[PDB]
Design a protein around this ligand. Structure first.
Ligand code: HEM
Ligand SMILES: N=C(N)C1CCCC1
Length: 292
């Protein structure tokens, strides 16, 4: 019941944040080899989600505001295994722009990755403020993958997301891959998708899925094509309400982009109070738009 008021980094404006965006985007382009040539796009999206997804609407603990992923309890959350790669990517960015708060940097990294991967524009607001180590939420607030649609629906109520918002946000699972050592769910061994599209929904609907056990003895849904879905992914076509929305996004790229952009911004802003005279949300230009 904590109040976190957005406070703009002193004297900073749109141009300052576009510079940070640009530095992230340029490094995304440069460090192209990461994870068998997937690049750092997907892991930066996952990082922005995990630092936000600790939020609890009931007492306003967790959330992106405090930048608490920088503290050992949170960065060592078993749910966050692999995200150290995103944090290391952002380290030199933070060094170049030491004035940006940690929450702002982690959330901006997600926005930048989505846009640079040809996703929708995601309006972004500055003003998250680093909070002390004792404000770090405990482990166990991020969702399990081995569960069903009812679990997913209930889980996301804590983040104030409804069915449409849940289904839209899950479209980010078009990006990157599971890594057996991180999560107990499997390779492809090589490259995966690093372009932001509605392919998650198309694959759910069109692939011939088989329920198999992986080398970690966990069940996952696999296709002959070499794709996989988590049990929680597959639950979106098992539940009739989720299934309708899956079909909608599979058949309308623009609608998916618009809904994802709204839900992703909301996720990244949950728990933050923006003063009435705060700057309007910024919409950053991509490198391509800038001729960079
Ligand atoms: C029911 C909710 C969710 C569950 C159970 C879940 C679970 C997982 C798991 C187990 C992984 C694999 C981690 C690894 O092995 O490296 C993963 C990866 C990923 N997740 Fe989710 N996730 C959920 C929701 C979301 C949301 C809401 C987003 C963003 C909007 C997201 C973005 C990603 C991305 C981009 C990756 C790929 C990361 C990489 O390639 O390094 N996930 N997720
Ligand atoms: N369904 C998939 N292939 C996603 C890859 C990252 C988590 C799940």
């Amino acid at each position: 019941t904590l109040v976190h008021v957005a406070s703009v980094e002193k004297g900073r404006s749109y141009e300052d944040f576009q510079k940070v965006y640009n530095a992230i985007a340029l490094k995304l382009r440069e460090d192209d080899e990461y994870d068998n040539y997937i690049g750092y796009g997907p892991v930066l999206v996952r990082l922005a989600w995990h630092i936000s997804g600790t939020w609890d609407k009931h007492d306003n603990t967790g959330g992106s505001y405090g930048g608490t992923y920088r503290f050992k309890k949170e960065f060592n959350d078993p749910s966050n295994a692999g995200l150290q790669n995103g944090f290391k990517f952002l380290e030199p960015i933070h060094k170049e722009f030491p004035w940006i708060s940690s929450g702002d940097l982690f959330s901006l990294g997600g926005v930048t990755a989505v846009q640079e991967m040809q996703g929708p524009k995601i309006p972004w607001r500055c003003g998250r403020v680093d909070t002390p180590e004792d404000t770090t939420p405990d482990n166990g607030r991020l969702p399990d993958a081995d569960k069903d649609a009812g679990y997913v629906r209930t889980f996301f109520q804590r983040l104030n997301m409804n069915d449409r918002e849940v289904v839209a946000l899950m479209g980010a699972h078009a990006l990157g891959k599971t890594h057996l050592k991180n999560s107990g769910y499997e390779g492809p061994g090589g490259a995966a998708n690093n372009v932001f599209t509605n392919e998650f929904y198309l694959n759910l609907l069109n692939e011939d899925w088989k329920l198999e056990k992986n080398d970690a003895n966990n069940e996952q849904w696999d296709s002959k094509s070499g794709y996989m879905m988590l049990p929680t992914d597959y639950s979106l076509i098992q539940d009739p309400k989720y299934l309708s929305i899956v079909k909608e996004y599979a058949n309308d790229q623009d609608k998916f982009f618009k809904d994802f952009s709204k839900a992703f911004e909301k996720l990244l802003e949950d728990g933050i109070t923006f003063p009435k005279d705060a700057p309007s949300p910024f919409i950053f230009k991509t490198l391509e738009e800038q001729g960079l």
